[PDB]
């Protein structure tokens, strides 16, 4: 009961009714390339980098969004769903400022990888790029937001996981900038999580600005002692001094989030 059978490339996985197309691929084990979709954040559909092709259907569907229906076989590696990613990645990269050797989310980029695995070998954007104006969101998060792919996960977290409801989108067109309209710092606990949740390195951590680069960091899994929730955390150490503490997921205690104090 309550177990539709949907095929992910003919694997007949069975899922509860109401599971998204992206979720159906996960249980088979396939990963839809995704931006703007975080498990504990509301589905928004902003990036549409997850377009897949349900069989016998005219258009490709939004994985994170379409509730999978009965007997719709998902074709995640079709000739179409790759042109639906080879052509989106064309766009995200087109307005992107190539300062990857500045972006300290160098190896921690969910946008170079997906470009480097699912995107395109070369660029055709012979036109000019855009630039936004760096502002102050506080003393912990450095928002070099010319990096932003307008994926609205910050505006969600800042409203849904934390109740700040401050960060918001401002304007329309290609100069929609997701920054506080008036310059009011994002002061709240749970603040630093925005860093971890922005896949782009637009806003990153200001103390850990340029002290390291992720491939080097040796990662040891340990426990938060600053507060009594005992949140799980990963201490990233390079050559013997701790460089960053970022969250590691514990369903029951800290589910992917850690306090501003303990990082």
């Amino acid at each position: 009961s309550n177990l539709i059978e949907v095929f992910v490339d003919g694997q007949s996985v069975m899922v509860e009714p109401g599971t998204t197309v992206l979720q159906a691929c996960e249980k088979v084990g396939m990963q839809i390339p995704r931006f703007c979709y975080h498990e504990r954040l509301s589905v928004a559909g902003n990036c549409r980098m997850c377009l897949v092709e349900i069989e016998k259907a005219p258009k490709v569907v939004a994985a994170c969004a379409m509730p999978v229906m009965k007997g719709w076989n998902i074709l995640t590696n079709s000739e179409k769903s790759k042109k639906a990613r080879e052509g989106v990645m064309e766009f995200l990269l087109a307005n992107h400022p190539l300062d990857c050797p500045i972006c300290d989310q160098g190896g921690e980029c969910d946008l170079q990888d997906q470009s480097m695995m699912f995107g395109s070998d070369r660029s055709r954007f012979l036109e000019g790029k855009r630039a936004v104006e760096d502002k102050n969101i506080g003393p912990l998060v450095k928002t070099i937001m010319t990096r932003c792919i307008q994926c609205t996960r910050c505006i969600r977290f800042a409203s849904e996981i934390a109740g700040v409801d401050d960060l918001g989108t401002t304007g329309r067109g290609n100069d929609m900038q997701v920054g506080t309209y008036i310059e009011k710092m994002f002061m709240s606990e749970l603040s630093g999580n925005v860093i971890d949740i922005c896949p782009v390195g637009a806003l990153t951590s200001k103390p850990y600005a340029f002290t390291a680069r992720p491939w080097e960091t040796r990662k040891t899994e340990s426990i938060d002692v600053m507060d009594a929730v005992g949140s799980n955390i990963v201490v990233s150490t390079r050559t013997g001094e701790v460089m960053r503490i970022l969250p590691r997921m514990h369903e029951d205690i800290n589910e992917e989030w850690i306090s501003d104090k303990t990082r």
Binding site: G45, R48, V88, F91, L92, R172, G173
Partner: protein, 426 residues
């Protein structure tokens, strides 16, 4: 074959000529069988539109009856609603500005006739804020109607209850979109919602909701008064009924005439309206449904008939049926270029494809008008065009790609020459 009789023409008050106010409306006899119709039943009203086979009078074409049928499902304890979008941001849609301004009442009874068909508790009319004066006209008309008791609880001396409201638009073409009209009504930013939760099941203030082009709501009463058949006959096959046609640009007498559908394209400029300025051979191209639809060159124009499917066969859309005509005296490369400028100044930016893609085509299109860009880039624009066509959250990205596709499809040699012209002078 068009040439609809004045009697058949639903919007008689078009052009005014008859008091747009109630007493003019009574001479029009717009509120003649309203009590009877509602009495017949909601099921009787939808039978009338199903028999009519009316297609959406807004840019998208879908059976009107089936769309209304969807939220005719039993209420789940949430009040069902009616949303009438009087916004018409698309260029050449002065189509709606008429009914609203000239014949506000027709739409008022369209609202309650339509309301009982969907069992809507109330209807909100989103007239674009640009039209402030237009708003002044409708609520004067809405105020008259309630004073009469035509609308309100126990509307038209019947069990059914309806309330009609007017909402201020704020200069956004996208507000027009069905999921985005709602969000503007909801008071959040006008950003289209996603497709899976159809507006029937979720909607305005999260209650069941339906959205209709003002023409679609307005034609409802008559379609029921005249019967689906009368209306059904004028149309062609799936296509059916008279839809207002607006002809603007390079025509001797630009005007909106509600002449019959399935009109030869050559005939409507030649017979009504004004023959193409400069002669029917001075036609570089025709935009049938407005900016969103691809323009068709004169080659096929005469052969074409104005129907939703007809244009489809032709690779173009009837859309709002706004005919924009371009003489041989126009730089199309720049004409379509401003429509892409029309869309960069307007798309919400919620979705990656449209945001960067429409801006990307705008930059390439501006270079194309100058001729700075090389000939090979043209194909890229096409390729950029279809990336945006199937990947967008709403249809506007659908709409931005089509004019670009039309320019490359029929006017590829001209753009190459502009390419060539700049290369020669160095």
């Amino acid at each position: 074959f068009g040439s609809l009789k004045d009697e058949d023409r639903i919007f008689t008050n078009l052009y005014g000529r008859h008091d747009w106010r109630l007493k003019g409306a009574l001479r029009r006899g717009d509120w003649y069988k309203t009590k009877e119709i509602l009495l017949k039943g909601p099921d009787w009203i939808l039978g009338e539109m199903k028999t009519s086979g009316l297609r959406g009078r807004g840019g998208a074409g879908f059976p009107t009856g089936l769309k209304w049928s969807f939220m005719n499902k039993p209420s789940d304890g949430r009040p069902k609603y009616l949303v009438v979008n009087a916004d018409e941001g698309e260029p050449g849609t002065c189509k709606d500005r008429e009914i609203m301004r000239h014949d506000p009442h027709k739409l008022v009874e369209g609202c309650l006739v339509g309301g009982r068909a969907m069992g809507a508790r109330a209807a909100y009319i989103y007239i674009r804020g640009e039209f402030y004066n237009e708003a002044s006209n409708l609520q004067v008309a809405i105020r008259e109607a309630y004073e009469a008791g035509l609308i309100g609880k126990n509307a038209c001396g019947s069990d059914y209850d309806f309330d009609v409201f007017v909402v201020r638009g704020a200069g956004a073409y996208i507000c027009g979109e069905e999921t985005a009209l709602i969000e503007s009504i909801e008071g959040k930013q006008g950003k289209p919602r996603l497709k899976p939760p159809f507006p029937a099941d979720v909607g305005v203030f999260g209650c069941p909701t339906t959205v209709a082009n003002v023409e679609t709501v307005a034609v409802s009463p008559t379609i029921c008064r005249r019967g689906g058949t009368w209306f059904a006959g004028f149309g062609r096959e799936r296509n059916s009924g008279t839809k207002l046609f607006n002809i603007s640009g390079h025509v001797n007498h630009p005007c909106t005439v509600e002449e019959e559908m399935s009109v030869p394209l050559k005939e409507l400029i030649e017979k009504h309206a004004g023959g193409v300025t400069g002669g029917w051979d001075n036609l570089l191209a025709v935009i049938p449904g407005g900016s969103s639809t691809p323009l068709i060159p004169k080659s096929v124009c005469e052969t074409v008939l104005m129907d939703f499917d007809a244009l489809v066969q032709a690779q173009t859309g009837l859309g709002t049926a706004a005919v924009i005509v371009m003489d041989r005296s126009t730089d199309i490369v720049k004409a379509i270029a401003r429509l892409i400028e029309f869309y960069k100044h307007e798309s919400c930016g919620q979705c990656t494809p449209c945001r960067e893609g429409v801006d990307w085509m705008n930059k390439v299109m501006a270079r194309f008008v100058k001729g700075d860009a090389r000939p090979a880039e043209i194909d890229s624009l096409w390729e950029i065009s279809k990336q945006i066509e199937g990947h967008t959250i709403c249809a506007l990205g659908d709409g931005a790609a089509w004019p670009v596709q039309g320019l490359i499809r029929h006017f590829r040699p001209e753009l190459e020459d502009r390419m060539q012209r700049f290369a020669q002078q160095h």
